[PDB]
Amino acid sequence: SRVCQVTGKRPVTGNNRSHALNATKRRFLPNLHSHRFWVESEKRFVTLRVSAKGMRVIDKKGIDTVLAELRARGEKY
Template sequence: RFLPNLQHHRFWVESEKRFVRLRTSTKGMRIIDKRGIDAVLSDMRARGEKI
């Protein structure tokens, strides 16, 4: 059975001057480190996900 390594992590969003708490996998954390939290949040908002 496949269980992803999900973590609750707070990311500081400099453009909004606040923390955002996301439930993400460790692979997702690496993607956020590579692309940047602003780019990831804009993609999530474009898909209509609540942040």
């Protein structure tokens, strides 16, 4: 599934409800674009899977626990 690695953003519950008033499912997802950036603890530029607003979380939130949680789940960057 397409998920954001820094925020943990997942698929959502949601319906059509317009034309008709129906509870019909449509499958709702975060739109991925990625970001290629620097963290100073890795001796390299890093490309990480991010979606809308996820790059603006990296801008001003501390991520070293998530960089460790990805590794605690074995996920690659």
